[PDB]
Scaffold this active site. Structure first.
Site, PDB file in Angstrom:
ATOM      1  N   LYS A 159       8.041  -0.501   7.134  1.00 42.34           N
ATOM      2  CA  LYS A 159       8.925   0.070   8.056  1.00 42.34           C
ATOM      3  C   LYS A 159       8.106   0.598   9.329  1.00 42.34           C
ATOM      4  O   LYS A 159       8.981   0.697  10.446  1.00 42.34           O
ATOM      5  N   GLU A 185       5.233  11.994   8.376  1.00 43.17           N
ATOM      6  CA  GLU A 185       4.478  10.623   8.033  1.00 43.17           C
ATOM      7  C   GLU A 185       3.124  10.976   8.592  1.00 43.17           C
ATOM      8  O   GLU A 185       2.671  12.219   8.842  1.00 43.17           O
ATOM      9  N   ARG A 186       2.414   9.923   8.175  1.00 40.96           N
ATOM     10  CA  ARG A 186       0.767  10.144   8.667  1.00 40.96           C
ATOM     11  C   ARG A 186       0.488  10.536   9.872  1.00 40.96           C
ATOM     12  O   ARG A 186       0.988  10.454  10.803  1.00 40.96           O
TER      13      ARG A 186
HETATM   14  N1  LIG Z   1       4.251  -8.415  10.493  1.00 40.55           N
HETATM   15  C1  LIG Z   1       3.351  -8.246   9.661  1.00 40.55           C
HETATM   16  N2  LIG Z   1       2.316  -9.086   9.710  1.00 40.55           N
HETATM   17  C2  LIG Z   1       1.194  -8.822   8.767  1.00 40.55           C
HETATM   18  N3  LIG Z   1       1.173  -7.813   7.959  1.00 40.55           N
HETATM   19  C3  LIG Z   1       1.957  -6.922   7.974  1.00 40.55           C
HETATM   20  C4  LIG Z   1       3.067  -7.057   8.863  1.00 40.55           C
HETATM   21  N4  LIG Z   1       3.799  -5.899   8.591  1.00 40.55           N
HETATM   22  C5  LIG Z   1       3.483  -5.372   7.647  1.00 40.55           C
HETATM   23  N5  LIG Z   1       2.095  -5.761   7.305  1.00 40.55           N
HETATM   24  C6  LIG Z   1       1.123  -5.267   6.508  1.00 40.55           C
HETATM   25  O1  LIG Z   1       2.066  -4.346   5.549  1.00 40.55           O
HETATM   26  C7  LIG Z   1       1.513  -3.040   5.941  1.00 40.55           C
HETATM   27  C8  LIG Z   1       2.679  -2.128   5.882  1.00 40.55           C
HETATM   28  O2  LIG Z   1       2.564  -1.062   6.859  1.00 40.55           O
HETATM   29  P1  LIG Z   1       3.643   0.007   7.381  1.00 40.55           P
HETATM   30  O3  LIG Z   1       3.123   1.187   7.954  1.00 40.55           O
HETATM   31  O4  LIG Z   1       4.913  -0.751   8.062  1.00 40.55           O
HETATM   32  O5  LIG Z   1       4.245   0.377   5.901  1.00 40.55           O
HETATM   33  P2  LIG Z   1       5.516   1.014   5.302  1.00 40.55           P
HETATM   34  O6  LIG Z   1       5.458   0.972   3.789  1.00 40.55           O
HETATM   35  O7  LIG Z   1       6.838   0.814   6.142  1.00 40.55           O
HETATM   36  O8  LIG Z   1       5.155   2.564   5.701  1.00 40.55           O
HETATM   37  P3  LIG Z   1       4.849   4.065   4.590  1.00 40.55           P
HETATM   38  O9  LIG Z   1       3.590   3.802   4.089  1.00 40.55           O
HETATM   39  O10 LIG Z   1       4.851   5.071   5.840  1.00 40.55           O
HETATM   40  O11 LIG Z   1       6.114   4.140   3.751  1.00 40.55           O
HETATM   41  C9  LIG Z   1       0.638  -2.866   7.277  1.00 40.55           C
HETATM   42  O12 LIG Z   1      -0.295  -2.011   7.326  1.00 40.55           O
HETATM   43  C10 LIG Z   1       0.054  -4.312   7.247  1.00 40.55           C
HETATM   44  O13 LIG Z   1      -0.834  -4.281   6.293  1.00 40.55           O
END
Ligand SMILES: Nc1ncnc2c1ncn2[C@@H]1O[C@H](COP(=O)(O)OP(=O)(O)OP(=O)(O)O)[C@@H](O)[C@H]1O
Ligand SMILES: Nc1ncnc2c1ncn2[C@@H]1O[C@H](COP(=O)(O)OP(=O)(O)OP(=O)(O)O)[C@@H](O)[C@H]1O
Ligand SMILES: [Mg+2]
Ligand SMILES: [Mg+2]
Lengths: 464, 393, 50, 334, 464, 36, 50
Positions: A159, A185-186
């Site tokens: 996200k 969020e963080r």
């Molecule tokens: N396009 C991408 N290519 C490679 N790795 C990715 C990609 N998108 C996400 N990731 C990996 O997945 C992790 C998810 O990060 P992100 O902050 O988007 O998580 P989230 O689950 O949406 O957030 P939260 O923990 O705030 O709910 C990223 O830190 C990276 O490790």
């Protein structure tokens, strides 16, 4: 005259006022914590009238060290935040106090963070497509300029990476103003976004508001309203086109649930506040654009326990023009941007708006992916071998389509090193038309990972 | 021209009356989140409209020995403790009349489209008893949805209730708005026995979505005979709980006058949520799924008023198309099953079918219309007598 | 469809002009009407004429 | 056709805007004229008289057990105090207040005495062994009558004893012939408490010692030389047993109880200015005719009403204020 | 002597009376609503004694318009309903007020709506089969004359259509009295039933009592008891065979649950009242027949959330001799009446009663359908050709048996257009014996769909 | 102190016949009957 | 800021530590990793995931 604290229940404080000087709802009250280690000017927001001249208030700063019987002074007006072009390029907290330099914004015009949503007569339906440059978004979930967009998902699905990717795609070349609201969020991500925008020189065009995790539920739910007040000022008074990123808006409802538990309100279905829909709407209805003045909002949404039926996502679904569900299954396959093509939807994916060719290709892709999902029950046990030949071909091109919807995003560089790629709408439509027609069934599935384009697809195929 | 502008205000000023009456007052002793307790008002009736200082109306739901628990129907932000509360002397009621056609109105009937005041003929209470078993006649007149699937497999007749139920983005609002648009040809006849008036009740829909529906109706020429009772997400739970009843009352006024009405409730699920919110804020002990014990009596009390009146009552009708949003394609949930058992038929729009190409995505097997052939012309009854069962097989 | 839309837009513009002028004239008349209207309204509010 | 309808709607909207402008200007000018005219005292009195002429043409919180028990205790009190002198009534009142304070502090004794039972002999024995040697005979008899009967809640015993204590001073005033003085002077206390919300909120003995609350009262309110002694004693007794109720509301209820003991019902009247003696008597007569009881009128004269009288008696209100007329005119515009 | 309304909370009203005049439990009190639009005389039923002379009552009519302090008068007797041959041919509401001819029954004998069930001494088991003409009911779940029959089914699976069909099949060929109790069901169904009975000239032998779902909870609780009181008058005071159709009995318990929390009762299981079993037993045991005087009771039962393990259906199953369990799966498959052949049962399906020939065919059909149900898991994934030859032939037989259990019902002419059919019990037994033995295995499946008997099966087979 | 002693005497003070103060749904509350 | 998912299935098979790659990830990492270690481990994650 001033009041007097009579009860303290975590971040909720009951204050008794004289018989005739009870503050109005959402008024800002000030109390003093005098204990040296953490003395502060505690700010309270009146939330209920309990009777007997008592009002129950939500604390913005953590009520630690607060003593029963301390004087409480009402400001006579709701929590106010600075507004104007001066806010652009600075980092603010929930109460409008600037963070990068604390004295900033005191003399700026102040707006109450509580405001009625624009009258129904001033609302119009937004249908102009916003070409992000992501194949999945631009094909199956065409975002709406001036409309509300959501990025649903659980923990670790992408996200925030998508939010920053759309900051790169949209905000970096946006002609107007931007606002970012860090809601629960963080703080690490807030600082990272701050430095990223400073480096990209987009900071000067954006106003950052942060209500991050460590703060009590009060600010964790009013920070969204503060950021929305700045965005509303840019929308109305300045007539600028506004972008409004909100990461993460589920934390607004989570803080609402905590405050509801503290206020004595009986729990709802799964422990949420009974007014989940009302408290969610009083915010989302404000994020709307009006007739001559646009506000493109993009909101990350947390789906707790990966449960898309949880009341918070279920409520926030009704307030969106484009929705992009991120799923664990797509994320495990390595198909970043992690989008579930079937759950995600947009209101402008209509042949009258996106065109006959775009709609036809999108519908055919959705059909192929739905058939693949329906065949999962057999694929899991017996594999691809036992399907009918038509279904075998369908599943092969379905795997290729599922992987081609993956893309190498700029925000993904920091993770992968490979630079991001942009695919225009025409090329996406042509490529997926060819994929559905079977013109690429001879290429290996590995070629479509994170590829972003027909030319670059041919490049990787030659590499393989 | 200026003569009429002057004369309207002049007539209002002349008709202005200094009459004073023994109004009785109470005092708010507790307020917050749309609920206010009013001490006093000894003679307040159950479900009476209370008037708070800012022109804000509430409804007295709880009547204890100490206080009157009322739901604020409007902006509760200005409801302070100690404010005077006057009793309207009128049970929960909304204005009704032909002036409501082509308007967008709050659940209280006061317009929100930005145009003028609505010249209501009278006021109808929201809780009049539904037509009894002896005041109805069989649903026999077809209501043409314009959709082949519905008119062929699950026909909708004038006076019966067809629950459009499905997950998000399945085509429920599309089906209902198409039904409303398809009545323009009947409307243009000028014949009250063929004209179908419409009331699209929006509950918990973002204002821009209601604007989209209104634009679709306008471009289809449907606002000439359609009313929108909008309880958008922003409004407190009171409006979202009251809106179906306001729409049903506006429709019932026409129904009892010999005219045919078509009520759409998008979404009765959002009404149940609003009622849950009101009940939990009133501190009623909840039942299953945290819902109030009598949510069934809510949806039933609403839908059972959609009926085909007998010839002795003018022969009118009100066709109800309640819309329900099932979470995760679960038609076995509580509220979905309640509404299914309350209604005369169901159109289950399934996302899987919608993606497969079946638009609109009627799961033929689950869907059914208990009026069936009685709600179809003889031609379609003959060419499509067994179509639904054939498709299910 | 396009021809009808253009004709409708032109008619709306012509109305927005001519009807605006008509409203200006009616407003000029209402400006004279205000005194009597307010006087009678106050008389009704107080009672006993005046 | 849609464009034709749209231009017609635009015309209707312009007509609406013109009507709204005309009505807004008319109502604003009418409000200005009303304010100018009502400002003269002669016109103000004329409006008051016209309103009066127009008008001329026009234990509750105790459940069954507690209600009957309070009625029986009042009957016993009427039978007993009828033969007691002012000093005897005073002694009765102080002992009743003291036992009420003891019950307020000694919650266990209160629950034991108030818990309903079939046979009252254990309760009478408990009352006697604890109070018979500390209070006078009549007070002990009243306490025996109160405890012997059954109450809905424990707090109702304190309420009943306190009500009897108040009635003691009320009858002491009645025999002294001070009824009118105490009524008016208690109304003066009510006004003083209303004008000082902090003071009224601060007399809550529930939050502090009753001795300190009565000391504050004496220093602030009843220490003034001009206060009637009976009223001061009444309000001190009420506040020392206030039990969390607001002092202003307690005093208003006390004055209402006094006038009810007389028999009349008090109606709070607000006017732009004090009415004439003829206006006062006309208002009293018309209110008595409307409500069928002798009505005591208290004037809260304030200029905000800007005209005719407004009346509040019980739950009913008459609203003839010119401010209400202006609000109705402004809100009723099309 | 008269009471006084003290507290009103939805359908529950508290009335304070003088000490010596507290009404007894289940007595009927009268209040007055004087508001013009909703003016009426409101009948309350005492449900609890709260103490201090307070009683708590359920309202048989909506409490809208009721005012605190309004006088409440005690009738001195429980809600009474008219009884006699006069009630036949008329439509009554729960209070005994005639609808089609107001004031009709005001001079008849009135019986208390509340009365104890017949003593265990008078009870005798019933073991006579009630041939109805439906293949599935006659074969697998034979109905008991003088016993209790139920039609379980989720929301909208055809309970009303099936109960109307069985009215047509039993009452229309039955010389005794019939009573219908529209407990909390759709008013359109009741009106259609009334019109049908009038047209078929069966109304004169039928007494209809409607408490349909538009009514408040009290009327839904007590309409069943009113109709049942008419039934027991016809049973005990006239020795006449009686049919008591109740649609839908679950609404009695549901109405009890709606007022359960307002009466001060803690919730049980999934939101149901603690007294579910007690109340439903008190109501059901009155429906039983006593030796020499039979009530053939047929009561539809709703299965909330389409979950047969819900407490209400589970507790109702114990009060029934025959149980036709409708299911949404069969309905979706298109096999109307939608009876679940396996989950359904009847206590008279004993080789000592229906005969060994009937029992053997019924048990063979059940075995074949159970084996088909077990095999449906394999077939959907592995395929049909991977089964054993015996299992494959059994699957064919099972599909044909499922489709033959369907029948063109008389009351379902609107569903299918074609007229109904009556299949004699012996013909059903022979047809299903042949199906289990395979003499019709060569015909196509559709030949058995919605076909009422062997002659019609042959006609359809020749048509296909 | 003496208040506690008086309360002790009163509590130690306790055919026995009670009174139904509350009834409903198969449950009846009986005031009295100290030795039940 | 990233999770090291230790799977029990790998743990029982002798793979200790049982870091389940792919699901395991570090977000704030990569920036904080000595250059040599990054150069040698760049392809390692892809290799093990494949
Ligand atoms: N396009 C991408 N290519 C490679 N790795 C990715 C990609 N998108 C996400 N990731 C990996 O997945 C992790 C998810 O990060 P992100 O902050 O988007 O998580 P989230 O689950 O949406 O957030 P939260 O923990 O705030 O709910 C990223 O830190 C990276 O490790
Ligand atoms: N028959 C149809 N053919 C093609 N597209 C359709 C059809 N019906 C609906 N759609 C489209 O599918 C989407 C469904 O939108 P719609 O508002 O009708 O659904 P809904 O179930 O009411 O959703 P929501 O609960 O979000 O309001 C929209 O894109 C609509 O344009
Ligand atoms: Mg994140
Ligand atoms: Mg919709």
């Amino acid at each position: 005259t001033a009041g007097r604290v009579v009860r303290i229940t975590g971040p909720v404080v009951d204050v008794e006022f004289p018989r005739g000087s009870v503050p109005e709802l959402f008024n800002a009250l000030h109390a003093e914590i005098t204990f040296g280690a953490l003395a502060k000017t505690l700010t309270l927001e009146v939330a209920q009238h309990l009777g007997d001249s008592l009002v129950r208030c939500i604390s913005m700063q953590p009520t630690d060290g607060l003593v029963r019987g301390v004087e409480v002074t009402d400001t006579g007006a709701s929590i106010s935040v600075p507004v104007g072009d001066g806010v652009k390029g600075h980092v603010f907290n929930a109460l409008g106090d600037c963070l990068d330099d604390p004295g900033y914004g005191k003399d700026f015009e102040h707006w109450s963070i509580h405001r009625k949503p624009p009258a129904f007569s001033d609302l119009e339906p937004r249908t102009e497509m916003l070409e992000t440059g992501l194949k999945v978004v631009d094909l199956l979930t065409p975002y709406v300029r001036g409309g509300k967009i959501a990025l649903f998902g659980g923990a670790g699905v992408g996200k925030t990476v998508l939010i920053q990717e759309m900051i790169n795609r949209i905000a970096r070349n946006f002609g107007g103003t931007s606002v970012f609201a860090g809601v629960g969020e963080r703080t690490r991500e807030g600082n990272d976004l701050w430095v990223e925008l400073a480096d990209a020189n987009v900071l000067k065009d954006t106003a950052l508001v942060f209500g991050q995790m460590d703060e009590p539920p009060g600010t964790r739910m009013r920070v969204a309203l503060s950021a929305l007040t700045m965005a509303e000022f840019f929308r109305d008074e300045q007539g600028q086109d506004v972008l409004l990123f909100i990461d993460n808006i589920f934390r607004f409802t989570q803080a609402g649930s905590e405050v509801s538990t503290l206020l004595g309100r009986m729990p709802s279905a799964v422990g949420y506040q009974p007014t989940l829909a009302d408290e969610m709407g009083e915010l989302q209805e404000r994020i709307t654009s009006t007739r001559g003045r646009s506000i493109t909002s993009m909101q990350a949404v947390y789906v707790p326990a990966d449960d898309y039926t949880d009341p918070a996502p279920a409520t926030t679904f009704a307030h969106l023009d484009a929705t992009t569900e991120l799923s664990r299954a797509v994320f495990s396959k390595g198909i970043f941007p992690a989008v579930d093509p079937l759950a995600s939807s947009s209101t402008i994916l209509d042949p009258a708006i996106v065109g006959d060719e775009h709609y036809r290709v999108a519908q055919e892709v959705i059909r192929i992916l739905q058939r693949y999902k329906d065949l999962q029950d057999i694929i899991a046990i017996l594999g691809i071998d036992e399907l009918s030949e038509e279904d075998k071909q369908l599943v092969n091109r379905a795997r290729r389509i599922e992987r081609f919807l993956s893309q190498n995003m700029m925000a993904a560089e920091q993770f992968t090193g490979q630079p991001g790629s942009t695919v225009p709408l025409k090329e996406t439509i042509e490529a997926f038309d060819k994929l559905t027609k079977g013109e690429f069934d001879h290429l290996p599935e590995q070629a479509f990972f994170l590829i972003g384009g027909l030319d670059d697809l041919a490049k990787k195929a030659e590499s393989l | 021209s200026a003569a009429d502008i002057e004369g309207a205000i002049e007539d209002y000023v002349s008709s202005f009356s200094a009459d004073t009456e023994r109004e009785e007052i109470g005092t708010v002793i507790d307020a917050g989140d749309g609920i206010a307790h009013v001490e006093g008002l000894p003679s307040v009736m159950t479900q009476e409209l209370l008037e708070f200082p800012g022109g804000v109306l509430g409804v007295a739901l709880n009547l204890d020995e100490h206080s009157v628990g009322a739901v604020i129907l409007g902006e509760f932000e200005k409801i302070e403790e100690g404010q005077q509360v006057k009793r309207t002397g009128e049970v929960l009621s909304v204005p009704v009349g032909d002036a409501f056609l082509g308007r967008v109105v709050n659940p209280l009937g006061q317009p929100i489209d930005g145009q003028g005041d609505i010249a209501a003929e009278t006021r109808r209470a929201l809780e009049l008893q539904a037509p009894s078993v002896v005041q109805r006649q069989s649903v026999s007149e077809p209501l043409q949805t314009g959709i082949k699937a519905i008119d062929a497999m699950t026909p909708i007749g004038r006076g019966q209730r067809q629950l459009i139920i499905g997950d998000r983005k399945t085509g429920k609002t599309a089906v209902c708005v198409d039904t409303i648009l398809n009545q323009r040809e009947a409307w243009l006849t000028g014949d009250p026995k063929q004209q179908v008036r419409c009331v699209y009740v929006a509950i918990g829909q973002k204002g821009t979505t209601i604007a989209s529906v209104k634009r679709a109706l306008e471009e289809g020429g449907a606002m000439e005979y359609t009313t929108i009772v909008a309880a958008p997400a922003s409004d407190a739970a009171g409006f979202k709980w009251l809106a179906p009843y306001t729409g049903s009352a506006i429709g019932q006024h026409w129904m009892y006058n010999g005219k045919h009405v078509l009520i759409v409730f998008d979404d009765l699920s959002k009404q149940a949520d609003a009622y849950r919110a009101i009940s939990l804020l009133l501190r009623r002990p909840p039942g299953r799924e945290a819902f109030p014990g009598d949510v069934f009596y809510l949806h039933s009390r609403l839908l059972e008023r959609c009926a085909k009146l007998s010839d002795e009552l003018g022969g009118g009708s009100m066709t109800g198309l309640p819309i329900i949003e099932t979470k995760a394609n679960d038609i076995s949930a509580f509220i979905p099953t309640n509404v299914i058992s309350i209604t005369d038929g169901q159109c289950f729009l399934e996302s899987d079918l919608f993606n497969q190409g079946v638009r609109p995505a009627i799961n033929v097997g689950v869907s059914v219309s208990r009026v069936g052939g009685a709600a179809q012309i003889k031609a379609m009854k003959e060419v499509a007598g067994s179509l639904r069962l054939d498709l299910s097989q | 469809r396009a021809q009808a839309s253009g004709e409708v837009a032109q008619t709306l513009t012509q109305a927005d002009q001519q009807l605006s002028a008509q409203g200006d004239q009616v407003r000029s008349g209402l400006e004279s009407s205000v005194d009597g209207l307010s006087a009678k309204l106050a008389s009704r509010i107080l009672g006993v004429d005046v | 056709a849609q464009g034709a309808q749209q231009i017609q709607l635009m015309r209707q909207q312009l007509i609406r805007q013109l009507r709204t402008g005309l009505g807004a200007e008319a109502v604003n000018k009418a409000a200005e004229i009303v304010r100018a005219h009502v400002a003269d005292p002669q016109a103000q009195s004329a409006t008051v008289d016209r309103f009066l002429s127009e008008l001329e043409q026009m234990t509750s919180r105790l459940r069954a057990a507690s209600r009957q028990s309070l009625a029986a205790l009042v009957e016993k009190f009427d039978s007993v105090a009828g033969g007691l002198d002012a000093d005897g009534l005073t002694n009765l009142a102080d002992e009743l207040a003291s036992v009420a304070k003891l019950l307020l502090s000694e919650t266990a004794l209160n629950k034991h005495l108030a818990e309903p039972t079939d046979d009252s002999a254990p309760k009478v024995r408990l009352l006697e062994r604890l109070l018979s040697d500390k209070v006078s005979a009549t007070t002990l008899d009243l306490l025996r009558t109160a405890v012997s009967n059954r109450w809905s809640t424990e707090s109702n015993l304190i309420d009943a004893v306190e009500h009897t204590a108040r009635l003691a001073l009320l009858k002491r005033a009645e025999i002294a012939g001070e009824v009118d003085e105490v009524e008016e002077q208690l109304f003066r206390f009510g006004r003083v408490l209303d004008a000082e919300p902090r003071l009224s909120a601060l007399l809550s003995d529930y939050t502090t010692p009753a001795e300190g609350r009565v000391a504050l009262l004496d220093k602030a309110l009843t220490g003034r030389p001009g206060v009637n002694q009976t009223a001061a004693a009444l309000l001190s007794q009420t506040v020392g047993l206030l039990r969390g109720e607001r002092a202003d509301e307690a005093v208003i209820d006390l004055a209402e109880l006094a006038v009810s003991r007389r028999g009349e019902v008090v109606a709070h009247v607000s006017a732009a200015a004090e009415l004439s003696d003829a206006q006062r008597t006309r208002l009293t007569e018309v209110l008595s005719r409307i409500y069928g009881r002798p009505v005591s009128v208290q004037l809260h004269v304030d200029p905000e009403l800007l005209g005719g009288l407004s009346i509040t008696v019980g739950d009913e209100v008459i609203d003839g204020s010119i401010a209400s007329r202006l609000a109705a005119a402004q809100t009723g515009l099309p």
